[PDB]
Every structure is written in structure tokens, then in C-alpha cells.
Amino acid sequence: MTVIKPSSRPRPRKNKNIKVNTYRTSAMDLSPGSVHEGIVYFKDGIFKVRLLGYEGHECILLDYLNYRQDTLDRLKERLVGRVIKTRVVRADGLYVDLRRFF
């Protein structure tokens, strides 16, 4: 094996990024303008977003309506319940406001 001009340049490029830090209680947030997944419900003519997992978190879906209604899709009645992603208008605990986009 007469090695004269061997080609083997160094190229160290590993990737490491797990971010692991939790000193006692930590993390927290309740600002509006965030997206989340919830279940759909029907009542009062408008819709209702239930947050399963929190137990005691009920929200109302009005697409940021809070003024005049616009129910005109019998299909929405059969789709109710399905899980979708909506925007949060203001979560205070138990009763929250919800606005679906698109």
C-alpha cells in the first residue's frame, strides 16, 4: 500500500441541541393570539371549543363574532365535535373566548 497523496480532509460537524433545563416549577403563558387544538360543540346557535385534558376549561367559538350571527351550513352540524385548530381570544379559566380563522 504505497500511500503518496491520500485525500482525507477533516470535516467535523456534529449537531447537538436538546435544551434541557427545568429548575423546579417553570414555563408559563396565557397571552392571546396563539393557536391551539380543541373539540367543537354546538349550542346557542354558535359553536363551543372544549379543551380536553385540562378538565374545567370551556371556551366559546364565535369566530370573533360577539355581534350578529351567521349560521347557514347544516353540514357544520354533522362536523361539530371534530377536533380543529383555532385562535384564542382570552382564556381566563373555565370560560374563554375563541375565534376560528378561515
Task: Produce a short descriptive summary.
The chain has 102 residues and is mainly beta. Helices cover 6% and strands 31% of the residues. The chain is elongated and about 85 Å long.
Describe the structure.
- This is M156R.
- It comes from Myxoma virus (strain Lausanne) (MYXV).
- It is classed as viral protein.
- The protein has 102 residues and is mainly beta.
- It has one domain (1-102): Nucleic acid-binding proteins (OB fold (Dihydrolipoamide Acetyltransferase, E2P), Beta Barrel), CATH 2.40.50.140.
- Helix content is 6%, strand content 31%.
- Strands 1-2-3-5-4 form a five-stranded mixed barrel.
- The longest helix is centred in the last third of the chain and has 6 residues, at 74-79.
- The chain is elongated.
- 10% of the residues are buried.
Topology record:
Layout (H helix, E strand, L loop, with lengths): L34 E9 L2 E5 L7 E4 L12 H6 L3 E9 L3 E5 L3
Parallel strand pairs: 3-5
Antiparallel strand pairs: 1-2, 1-4, 2-3, 4-5
PDB class: viral protein
Keywords: beta barrel, S1 motif, OB Fold, myxv156R, nesg project, structural genomics, EIF-2a HOMOLOG, PSI, Protein Structure Initiative, Northeast Structural Genomics Consortium, Viral protein
Assembly: monomeric
